[PDB]
Amino acid sequence: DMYIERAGDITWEKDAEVTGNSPRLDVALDESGDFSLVE
Amino acid sequence: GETTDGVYRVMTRRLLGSTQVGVGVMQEGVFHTMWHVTKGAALRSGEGRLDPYWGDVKQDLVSYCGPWKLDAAWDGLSEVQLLAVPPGERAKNIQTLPGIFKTKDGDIGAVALDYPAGTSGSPILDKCGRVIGLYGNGVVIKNGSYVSAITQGKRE
Numbered sequence: 429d430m431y432i433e434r435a436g437d438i439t440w441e442k443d444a445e446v447t448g449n450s451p452r453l454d455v456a457l458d459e460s461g462d463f464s465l466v467e
Numbered sequence: 468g469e470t471t472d473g474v475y476r477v478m479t480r481r482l483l484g485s486t487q488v489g490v491g492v493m494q495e496g497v498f499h500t501m502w503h504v505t506k507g508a509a510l511r512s513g514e515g516r517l518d519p520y521w522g523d524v525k526q527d528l529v530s531y532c533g534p535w536k537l538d539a540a541w542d543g544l545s546e547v548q549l550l551a552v553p554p555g556e557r558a559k560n561i562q563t564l565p566g567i568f569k570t571k572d573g574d575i576g577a578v579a580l581d582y583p584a585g586t587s588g589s590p591i592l593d594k595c596g597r598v599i600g601l602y603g604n605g606v607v608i609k610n611g612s613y614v615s616a617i618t619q620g621k622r623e
């Protein structure tokens with residue numbers, strides 16, 4: 429059996445760690461909910 | 468039991484010790500998570516019980532106690548924050564500018580951040596703090612890194 433535990437409030441935090449790029453990727457979504465790259 | 472709004476961890480005892488399988492958002496008395504985390508199974512909240520209400524494997528989403536409530540959307544311009552809730556680690560806001568998943572059915576925002584699989588269900592937020600989608604369903608790119616989609620449901 430699965431259970432839930434609280435981890436915090438949902439707020440936007442000023443001065444957060446700004447990281448990660450913004451790629452443009454051509455993708456396909458299958459009937460099972462799996463994304464795949466169409467390169 | 469606990470019905471306060473916020474972000475929650477989804478845990479299991481089936482494996483060794485207490486293993487975190489995912490994350491979810493409580494909002495307006497409704498638990499929102501990703502389908503691949505729970506497989507549509509009932510959840511426990513202290514002494515209470517969360518039974519599924521809506522789900523869809525294609526969208527990879529599932530709501531408990533009521534219909535999907537989260538209806539905010541990425542504007543396609545602004546930076547967003549991934550409220551990451553990693554296995555065995557404190558909730559942490561990570562700001563990023565989303566990329567794009569171009570599909571035959573339209574464009575979807577995507578967040579290029581690599582966190583353990585057990586982080587799936589962590590909400591993505593706009594500058595107002597509104598949940599615009601959930602992290603944890605995407606693709607693996609050329610360099611081995613993971614890129615998740617900003618997955619959002621449809622409020623009736």
Ligand SMILES: Cc1cc(N)c2ccc(Cl)c(Cl)c2n1
Pocket residue numbers: 580581582583584585587603604607613
């Ligand atoms: C290979 C890989 C790497 C990840 N960081 C990751 C995060 C969430 C989910 Cl749902 C999956 Cl399937 C993942 N798969």
